[PDB]
Scaffold this active site. Structure first.
Site, PDB file in Angstrom:
ATOM      1  CG  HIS B  41      37.635  36.603  35.725  1.00 13.48           C
ATOM      2  ND1 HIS B  41      38.360  35.892  34.785  1.00 13.48           N
ATOM      3  CD2 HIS B  41      37.663  37.914  35.396  1.00 13.48           C
ATOM      4  CE1 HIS B  41      38.797  36.792  33.917  1.00 13.48           C
ATOM      5  NE2 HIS B  41      38.397  38.018  34.237  1.00 13.48           N
ATOM      6  N   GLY B 143      41.186  44.652  31.329  1.00 11.32           N
ATOM      7  CA  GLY B 143      39.954  44.831  30.564  1.00 11.32           C
ATOM      8  C   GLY B 143      39.847  43.969  29.310  1.00 11.32           C
ATOM      9  CB  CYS B 145      39.036  39.175  30.891  1.00  8.25           C
ATOM     10  SG  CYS B 145      40.590  39.143  31.821  1.00  8.25           S
TER      11      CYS B 145
HETATM   12  C1  LIG Z   1      45.752  37.449  37.858  1.00  9.49           C
HETATM   13  O1  LIG Z   1      44.493  37.881  37.340  1.00  9.49           O
HETATM   14  C2  LIG Z   1      43.473  36.969  37.281  1.00  9.49           C
HETATM   15  C3  LIG Z   1      43.524  35.683  37.807  1.00  9.49           C
HETATM   16  C4  LIG Z   1      42.447  34.830  37.631  1.00  9.49           C
HETATM   17  C5  LIG Z   1      41.322  35.251  36.947  1.00  9.49           C
HETATM   18  C6  LIG Z   1      41.249  36.535  36.432  1.00  9.49           C
HETATM   19  C7  LIG Z   1      42.323  37.398  36.589  1.00  9.49           C
HETATM   20  O2  LIG Z   1      42.382  38.667  36.071  1.00  9.49           O
HETATM   21  C8  LIG Z   1      41.161  39.405  35.903  1.00  9.49           C
HETATM   22  C9  LIG Z   1      41.501  40.687  35.196  1.00  9.49           C
HETATM   23  N1  LIG Z   1      42.652  40.545  34.314  1.00  9.49           N
HETATM   24  C10 LIG Z   1      42.907  41.415  33.336  1.00  9.49           C
HETATM   25  O3  LIG Z   1      42.110  42.302  33.026  1.00  9.49           O
HETATM   26  C11 LIG Z   1      44.240  41.298  32.666  1.00  9.49           C
HETATM   27  C12 LIG Z   1      44.390  40.361  31.693  1.00  9.49           C
HETATM   28  C13 LIG Z   1      45.563  40.215  30.907  1.00  9.49           C
HETATM   29  O4  LIG Z   1      45.745  39.292  30.109  1.00  9.49           O
HETATM   30  N2  LIG Z   1      46.558  41.126  31.142  1.00  9.49           N
HETATM   31  C14 LIG Z   1      46.506  42.114  32.119  1.00  9.49           C
HETATM   32  C15 LIG Z   1      47.579  42.989  32.287  1.00  9.49           C
HETATM   33  C16 LIG Z   1      47.543  43.943  33.288  1.00  9.49           C
HETATM   34  C17 LIG Z   1      46.457  44.029  34.139  1.00  9.49           C
HETATM   35  C18 LIG Z   1      45.406  43.166  33.948  1.00  9.49           C
HETATM   36  F1  LIG Z   1      44.349  43.260  34.783  1.00  9.49           F
HETATM   37  C19 LIG Z   1      45.363  42.210  32.941  1.00  9.49           C
END
Ligand SMILES: COc1ccccc1OCCNC(=O)c1cc(=O)[nH]c2cccc(F)c12
Ligand SMILES: COc1ccccc1OCCNC(=O)c1cc(=O)[nH]c2cccc(F)c12
Lengths: 304, 304
Positions: B41, B143, B145
């Site tokens: 992703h 961030g 991931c």
């Molecule tokens: C619903 O998001 C996706 C779905 C499918 C594939 C990827 C998805 O996310 C990509 C980015 N995600 C993060 O960086 C993320 C990971 C995490 O464990 N907690 C978070 C808490 C708050 C904000 C966040 F962006 C996160």
């Protein structure tokens, strides 16, 4: 989201761990620059531990009696000195893996990561707090002595603890890196009173703010309190009295959540008086006190 | 003595972490030998995340679009491929810090350490369990991931998890290092049922043995039970049914303590039916299930 008892990444500290043997005793040492730091009780035998005369015992020891091994390479000892309860073994080679570092004496209620070691090899890493009574509730077996506690600010490791002993009560005591014990403890195999421990109030409040940030809000109520009223409750439940300095440190978390510190105090008051009623907060069924306000912001903002 | 939620020392894994940027998205990558592994992703934009066509998105990407940085040095990408939900970026330099390693798919109920990373830099390390429903209750922000889970057997790191997403429920989902999701999860921003979670019975029993080894014995009773009787209670309380394989794995702990597994089951049965009555076990007011029998023996014997 989510909230874990997170330790600092231990890499910078793993590269400093060495094994120190003196006579038949082996423990862990900390190699920084051309000095190896270890608990001075490495020079004792089992007859000695009951009341050791460290100055006398150390006088029978020469540089060649301290066997210092880093992984599988032997370090050459060119000097030895005792500073308080630690030994400083001067070696002829500076540790190539020495990170930027400081020696700091932490305050009661502050947290740190411990890298538990045996025979100079790391086994695990865990986060803990220096209790108000200057003990730590660690996990340490025979051979763990010389394992250290630390905090990391970007590239600098601040070493705050060196493990020396387990009290008969099963709690742990140790020193700062200048060999000064935290608390009243002596490096002698005797019964030693730890004294009344209390719950670190400012940390419980910081953890309640972490719970709000992470979605666990059931405990928020319609009440408020004053510092005096809250401290009457704190006294009854063996909590540290909250001060305006503690309120000021909780400032950023109060701003982030929009929940005034005294309002969070009122939530804590109701939880102390009524318990959890079989509910949980951040996966815990008790009030957690081993996360400082700094820890909560760090974990909730992703500081590396 | 003492019992902590101890993670493996993270050094071997810290030396593998890199930052991967593709377009405007930055996440963590795992550099082992001449390959960088990261969640696929990384190639998506916010419009894409709702239902991404990964094959189509990856076709618009060339080796030069994947920016891989290790600390402050840039890695040259000479190949890219997608395997399931991971991207494999072939680089021209083998990681000099690559430890001995394996890629393993863990079973539900097993534990592992997570090294949470942001922008390729480690922030913390914590121990967790793969839930029976294939989620992890981690601590991860934007961030994170590409942060990985692992276990360490002496000098070999067995990577078992790569972080991909947080579900709307706030629990975490990810893959093995071949990019196969644990559980039914897809890498798409949609509502996804995690399904009924259960408590990992064999781990609660292993933790009760750790409690006995460490002095917390109040919960030991005069009773015994059978696997069938115990499993009737397990069903009612959403515990995994205990099997003879679980009894056999608890063998060493039963031998160490002299408490027959079914006798410990009877203690667990009474604790499930009557609760803790405001008491604690190893500093916890609930029944802990994120320590396997292997973890308990390791921590109680000092394996490095
Ligand atoms: C619903 O998001 C996706 C779905 C499918 C594939 C990827 C998805 O996310 C990509 C980015 N995600 C993060 O960086 C993320 C990971 C995490 O464990 N907690 C978070 C808490 C708050 C904000 C966040 F962006 C996160
Ligand atoms: C009472 O012992 C000392 C007193 C003064 C100074 C030093 C003392 O110990 C020296 C050695 N101690 C250990 O290796 C030790 C440390 C620990 O935290 N837990 C343990 C659990 C079980 C068995 C153990 F030996 C330990």
């Amino acid at each position: 989201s989510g909230f874990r008892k997170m330790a600092f990444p231990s890499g910078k500290v793993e590269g400093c761990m060495v094994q120190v043997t003196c006579g038949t005793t082996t423990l862990n040492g900390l190699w920084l620059d051309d000095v190896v730091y270890c608990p001075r009780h490495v020079i004792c035998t089992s007859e000695d531990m009951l009341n050791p005369n460290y100055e006398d015992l150390l006088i029978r020891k020469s540089n060649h009696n301290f066997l210092v091994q880093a992984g599988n390479v032997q370090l050459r000892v060119i000097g030895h000195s005792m500073q308080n309860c630690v030994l400083k073994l001067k070696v002829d080679t500076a540790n190539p893996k020495t990170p930027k570092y400081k020696f700091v004496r932490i305050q009661p209620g502050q947290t740190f990561s411990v890298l538990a070691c045996y025979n100079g090899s790391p086994s695990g890493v865990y986060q803990c707090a220096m209790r108000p009574n200057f003990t730590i509730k660690g996990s340490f077996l025979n051979g763990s002595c010389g394992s250290v506690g630390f905090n990391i600010d970007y590239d600098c490791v601040s070493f705050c603890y060196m493990h020396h002993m387990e009290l008969p009560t099963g709690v742990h005591a140790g020193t700062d890196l200048e060999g000064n014990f935290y608390g009243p403890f002596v490096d002698r195999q005797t019964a030693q009173a730890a004294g009344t421990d209390t719950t670190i109030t400012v940390n419980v409040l910081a953890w309640l703010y972490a719970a709000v940030i992470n979605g666990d809000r059931w405990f928020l109520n319609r009440f408020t309190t004053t510092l005096n009223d809250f401290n009457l409750v704190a006294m009854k439940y063996n909590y540290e009295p909250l001060t305006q300095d503690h309120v000021d440190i909780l400032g950023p978390l109060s701003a982030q959540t929009g929940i005034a510190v005294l309002d969070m105090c009122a939530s804590l008051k109701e939880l102390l008086q009524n318990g959890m009623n079989g509910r949980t907060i951040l996966g815990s069924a008790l009030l957690e006190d081993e996360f400082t306000p700094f820890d909560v912001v760090r974990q909730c903002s992703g500081v590396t």
